[PDB]
């Protein structure tokens, strides 16, 4: 089925954490745990604090996200 | 400081200067040496730049020792605290920051000027702001102990600030 409820909202990176997990403050409002894309990791695209990435968000829990796009 | 003495002298006629700052006249090198011997002291060709290139009786060795003693005091106080450098980084976490701050405080107490420096990599966008966030805060914390002499200043791949202490 792939539930396409996936919330494609932008956020500027507040903070860096390990394993490429990042508190990113959103255009939407909150700062929530959002970890990297696999794609980005593969491509070695270094997320650094102060960047407008696209944090994909689950409707089950927005408090965790997933970074999609390169800054 | 390092002068030319008794048997180093080839200046034929020296405008002789006695033990204390005397003016006897223009004596031959040999004559000057003889005079020195008479007092037992050391005749010092202090200047070949002068008028009849000049040699001056003194206890050269002793004088030098004295100078060194005096100079030692000066030389010890010549360095007398320089620059301690600390390299922060754009990310910086809290305990580390605290540690750094403590170090800086210690340095200030000791008496040294402090290069509060940041090394950078890529991503120059948030860079200066981030630096400010650290550095200015740090300065504020040590406002009781330190004075800003250099502000957020660029070196290209870096950034640098300076904190001399408050009281000399
Ligand atoms: Mg979607």
UniProtKB/Swiss-Prot annotation, chain A:
Database matches in Gene3D superfamilies: Nucleic acid-binding proteins
Disulfide bonds: none
CDD domains assigned: S1_IF1
Main location: cytoplasm
This protein's record includes keyword RNA-binding: yes
PROSITE patterns named in the record: S1_IF1_TYPE
Top-level taxon: Bacteria
This protein's UniProt keywords: Cytoplasm, Initiation factor, Protein biosynthesis, RNA-binding, rRNA-binding
Cellular-component GO terms for this entry: cytosol
Keyword Cytoplasm: yes
A GO MF term: translation initiation factor activity
Family per similarity comment: Belongs to the IF-1 family.
Quaternary structure note: Binds to the 30S ribosomal subunit, contacting protein S12 and the 16S rRNA. Component of the 30S ribosomal translation pre-initiation complex which assembles on the 30S ribosome in the order IF-2 and IF-3, IF-1 and N-formylmethionyl-tRNA(fMet); mRNA recruitment can occur at any time during PIC assembly.
Protein name, per record: Translation initiation factor IF-1
Species assigned in the record: Thermus thermophilus (strain ATCC 27634 / DSM 579 / HB8)
Gene that encodes the chain: infA
From Swiss-Prot, chain B:
Family matches, as SUPFAM superfamilies: Translation initiation factor IF3, C-terminal domain, Translation initiation factor IF3, N-terminal domain
GO biological processes: ribosome disassembly
Top-level lineage group: Bacteria
Cellular location(s): Cytoplasm
Cellular component annotations (GO), alphabetically ordered: cytosol; membrane
Residues passing through the membrane, by range: none
InterPro entries: T_IF-3_C_sf, T_IF-3_N_sf, Translation_initiation_fac_3, Translation_initiation_fac_3_C, Translation_initiation_fac_3_N
Gene3D superfamilies hit by this protein: Translation initiation factor 3 (IF-3), C-terminal domain, Translation initiation factor 3 (IF-3), N-terminal domain
Keywords: Cytoplasm, Initiation factor, Protein biosynthesis
Molecular function via GO: ribosome binding; translation initiation factor activity
UniProt xrefs under PANTHER family: TRANSLATION INITIATION FACTOR IF-3 (PTHR10938), TRANSLATION INITIATION FACTOR IF-3, MITOCHONDRIAL (PTHR10938:SF0)
Job description of the protein: IF-3 binds to the 30S ribosomal subunit and shifts the equilibrium between 70S ribosomes and their 50S and 30S subunits in favor of the free subunits, thus enhancing the availability of 30S subunits on which protein synthesis initiation begins.
Similarity field: Belongs to the IF-3 family.
Assembly: Monomer. Binds to proteins S7, S11 and S18 of the small ribosomal subunit.
Protein name: Translation initiation factor IF-3
